[PDB]
Amino acid sequence: ENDRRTLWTTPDPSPNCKVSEEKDSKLTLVLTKCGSQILASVSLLVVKGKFANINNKTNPGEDYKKFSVKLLFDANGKLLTGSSLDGNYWNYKNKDSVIGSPYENAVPFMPNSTAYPKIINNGTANPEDKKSAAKKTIVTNVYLGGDAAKPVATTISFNKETESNCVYSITFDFAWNKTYKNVPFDSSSLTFSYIAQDA
Amino acid sequence: ENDRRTLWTTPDPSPNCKVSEEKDSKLTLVLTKCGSQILASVSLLVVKGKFANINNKTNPGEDYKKFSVKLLFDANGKLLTGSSLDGNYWNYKNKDSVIGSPYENAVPFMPNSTAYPKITANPEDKKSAAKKTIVTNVYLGGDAAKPVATTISFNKETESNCVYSITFDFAWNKTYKNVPFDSSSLTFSYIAQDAE
Amino acid sequence: ENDRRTLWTTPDPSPNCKVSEEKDSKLTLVLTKCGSQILASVSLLVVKGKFANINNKTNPGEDYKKFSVKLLFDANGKLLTGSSLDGNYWNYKNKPYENAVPFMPNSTAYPKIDKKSAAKKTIVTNVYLGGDAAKPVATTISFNKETESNCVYSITFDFAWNKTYKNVPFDSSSLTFSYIAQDA
Numbered sequence A: 001e002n003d004r005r006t007l008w009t010t011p012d013p014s015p016n017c018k019v020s021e022e023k024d025s026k027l028t029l030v031l032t033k034c035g036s037q038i039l040a041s042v043s044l045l046v047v048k049g050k051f052a053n054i055n056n057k058t059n060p061g062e063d064y065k066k067f068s069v070k071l072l073f074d075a076n077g078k079l080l081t082g083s084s085l086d087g088n089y090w091n092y093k094n095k096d097s098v099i100g101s102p103y104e105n106a107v108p109f110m111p112n113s114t115a116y117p118k119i120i121n122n123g124t125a126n127p128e129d130k131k132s133a134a135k136k137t138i139v140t141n142v143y144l145g146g147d148a149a150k151p152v153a154t155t156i157s158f159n160k161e162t163e164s165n166c167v168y169s170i171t172f173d174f175a176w177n178k179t180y181k182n183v184p185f186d187s188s189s190l191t192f193s194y195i196a197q198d199a
Numbered sequence B: 001e002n003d004r005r006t007l008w009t010t011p012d013p014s015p016n017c018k019v020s021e022e023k024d025s026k027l028t029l030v031l032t033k034c035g036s037q038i039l040a041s042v043s044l045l046v047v048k049g050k051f052a053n054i055n056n057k058t059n060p061g062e063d064y065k066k067f068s069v070k071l072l073f074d075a076n077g078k079l080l081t082g083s084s085l086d087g088n089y090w091n092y093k094n095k096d097s098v099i100g101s102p103y104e105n106a107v108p109f110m111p112n113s114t115a116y117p118k119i120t121a122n123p124e125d126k127k128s129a130a131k132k133t134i135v136t137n138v139y140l141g142g143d144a145a146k147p148v149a150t151t152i153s154f155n156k157e158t159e160s161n162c163v164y165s166i167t168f169d170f171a172w173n174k175t176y177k178n179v180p181f182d183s184s185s186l187t188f189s190y191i192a193q194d195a196e
Numbered sequence C: 001e002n003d004r005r006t007l008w009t010t011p012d013p014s015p016n017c018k019v020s021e022e023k024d025s026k027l028t029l030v031l032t033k034c035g036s037q038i039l040a041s042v043s044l045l046v047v048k049g050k051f052a053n054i055n056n057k058t059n060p061g062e063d064y065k066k067f068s069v070k071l072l073f074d075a076n077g078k079l080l081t082g083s084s085l086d087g088n089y090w091n092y093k094n095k096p097y098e099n100a101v102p103f104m105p106n107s108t109a110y111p112k113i114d115k116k117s118a119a120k121k122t123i124v125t126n127v128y129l130g131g132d133a134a135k136p137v138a139t140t141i142s143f144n145k146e147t148e149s150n151c152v153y154s155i156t157f158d159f160a161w162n163k164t165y166k167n168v169p170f171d172s173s174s175l176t177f178s179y180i181a182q183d184a
Helices: none
Strands: A006-009 A025-034 A037-046 A066-073 A091-093 A137-143 A153-160 A168-175 A181-183 A191-196 B004-010 B025-034 B037-046 B064-074 B091-094 B133-139 B147-154 B164-171 B177-179 B188-190 C006-008 C024-033 C036-046 C066-073 C122-129 C135-141 C151-162 C166-168 C177-182
Touching: A025 A066, A025 B037, A037 B037, A037 C024, A037 C036, A091 C024, A137 A191, A137 C122, A153 A191, A153 C036, A191 B188, A191 C024, A191 C036, A191 C177, B025 B064, B037 C177, B064 B177, B091 B133, B133 B188, B147 B188, B147 C151, B188 C166, B188 C177, C024 C066, C036 C151, C135 C177, C166 C177
Parallel strands: none
Antiparallel strands: A006 A025, A006 A091, A025 A037, A037 A191, A066 A168, A137 A153, A153 A168, B004 B025, B004 B091, B025 B037, B037 B188, B064 B164, B133 B147, B147 B164, C006 C024, C024 C036, C036 C177, C066 C151, C122 C135, C135 C151
């Protein structure tokens, strides 16, 4: 029904995502099918490791000021091992939790291949032949502790990844230049949409 | 029929919202159920009072450079008195207006309690202030040059004895001169409560 | 089914849009009916002409630093000739006619015009050239702003920038937005 229209991490998940070390972050990600598009809400809380309490006064150097979170999917839209996200409670919605057994197909939640193809290569190619690197991307900000003063550059990228031997991918890249002092990585919620693959 | 999926202020409301004084603003808010989430559009036009013509040259102090708008809901998703918004024309859609009499239940439009709870030495147990928030900008007169910091907050409020809450907090640092508070439209989504 | 709920340019279009000269850009626009609202994604790639390789070092003037893209619709939500977008591959998902009032921006919410609202008809945001944080472009989406041809409805994408970009193709990041829909 409306349960099988949503593919999520529970709305209040247990640590389920690797940012620096195993299960160091809670990624809340909801994918809902509104017709041909996926409406998505995402937020990220890191609870231990490198990013659990950002301090770029004591750690300048860019590896403490950016990180990414990859979802990698196979042909059937199943979630692959290289993924930042743990697949245990990443499944179709069931009344505020998930379905019993793991899901066998989720292609209709995948970013559309035509709209977001995995390589783009311009030159030798006519103008009428050219494709869009940028189209594959949403560039926005999230705000740490929900504070306007603490922005984090956020690029969501569709089918950017080749890791494992994935067909589909959603990649959240976070980065900042402010030198934050004892700021937990606790993101504001972020709404976005992409064009869906057909079955 | 398909109109039971939408809960709105109507698309063209009469002044229906307190910002500084009684019915001084028109709040346009549409809530639509897309599956497990609420797709929402909001805009705010203030037509009289403190914010009808911002001038922080003549009033520099902070209280003339920020304000909030609270929607407070009970257990059944009915609107409480503490709310900034008047309940008279806030109801399920009917063909570009609203249904005749008020409805008593709208829980499925409420911000999810699990995702956005009211809230601790332990990191791995702790819950997220920020998750409950969307931080963005609206633009006065729809002008890129006139930004307004906008925080939407789910279940932040305790006023009256509300279970659910949507809070629009506006603030600015630019000292605007004779700029009406006329916001650009703002799309957002939140995860919805389920109705047992 | 949900085919008739989507009105798009197709997800990977052939050049289909005038920015400066005929068919000089690929406009990707998806409109989906989620209840009373339209959920939309838009992105623009210009492939030839004035904006195919922006350089405001060599062309500083205003006309090289902004442009708009107009969709003009009649009473039935059919696409009119004055439009920036070519009508040939602008149709319901899986292909052909438009008769598509339910995808139009609501007249009450967004009229042609105590007080009334300039802003309400507008969404003001940024897109990013090449998907690069460093290359912002001021973007205003406007509903029923246009009078060209004899349109009833209109969607207008206005892009503008002040940064002096050097050999930057106009390749926009995707942009999600919603508006209140007209009833049939």
